Amino acid sequence: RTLHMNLIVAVDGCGGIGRNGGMPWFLPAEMARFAKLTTLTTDSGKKNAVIMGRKVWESIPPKFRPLKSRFNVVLSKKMKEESNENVVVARSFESAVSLLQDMENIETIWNIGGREVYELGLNSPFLHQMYITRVEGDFLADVFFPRVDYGRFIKSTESEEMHEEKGIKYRYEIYTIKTDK
């Protein structure tokens, strides 16, 4: 019945998320946490879904692609269909969300973005939480997280320390839409 769409993203001090079609940094521990958050379900035997844009799909190393143990949905008007049964190509956000809510074995939808995919998520009735990694500094991004009104959310108050790997510092944040908390 209740179906959550959570967003997950890492943004720099300017709100940047991408540079030259890829990520402006590489943070293996942060990536491991990403994989755990998007894969783990409470009901064993249920699966999570990730919804992403074409350029996110093209930015995943083909070894890690499709993202294991998750149902992959790629938004694209130009991409040909994917033979793999863990990947479906959807032509609109509405059709992707309808397809996902039709599937009973899907527990949570993880919106892993592309700016426009994040933007559509922020207007979705299923919007629940934002898991935002805030990375310190300006990585000269050319793609940014959407403009968002944080006044719509409650920022969780659990203790959050600084992290550092590869000389790059970051901190985790969690937001819950006010109409749920």
Ligand X SMILES: N#Cc1ccc(CC(=O)O)c(NC(=O)c2ccc(Cc3c[nH]c4nc(N)[nH]c(=O)c34)cc2)c1
Number of residues lying near ligand NAP (CB under 6 A): 27
Cis peptide upstream of residue 66 (ω within 30 degrees of 0): yes
> Do residues 34 and 111 make contact, with C-beta atoms less than 8 angstroms apart?
no
Q: Does 101 bind ligand NAP (CB under 6 A)?
A: no
| Smaller CB separation from ligand X, 1 or 70 | 70
| CB-closest chain residue to ligand NAP | 114
Interatomic CA distance for residues 102 and 11, integer angstroms: 32
Considering only residues 63 to 102 of the shown chain, the ones binding ligand X according to CB under 6 A are 64, 67-68
> Do residues 131 and 114 make contact, with C-beta atoms less than 8 angstroms apart?
no
Q: Does 9 bind ligand X (CB under 6 A)?
A: yes
Residue from 5, 10, 90, 117 touching ligand X (CB under 6 A): that is 10
Q: Does 93 bind ligand NAP (CB under 6 A)?
A: yes
Considering only residues 20 to 49 of the shown chain, the ones binding ligand X according to CB under 6 A are 23, 28, 30-32, 34-35, 38
Give the footprint of ligand NAP on this chain (CB under 6 A). 9-10, 17-18, 21-23, 53-56, 59, 75-79, 91-93, 113-117, 120, 143
Binding-site members for NADPH are 10, 17, 22, 54-56, 76-78, 115-116
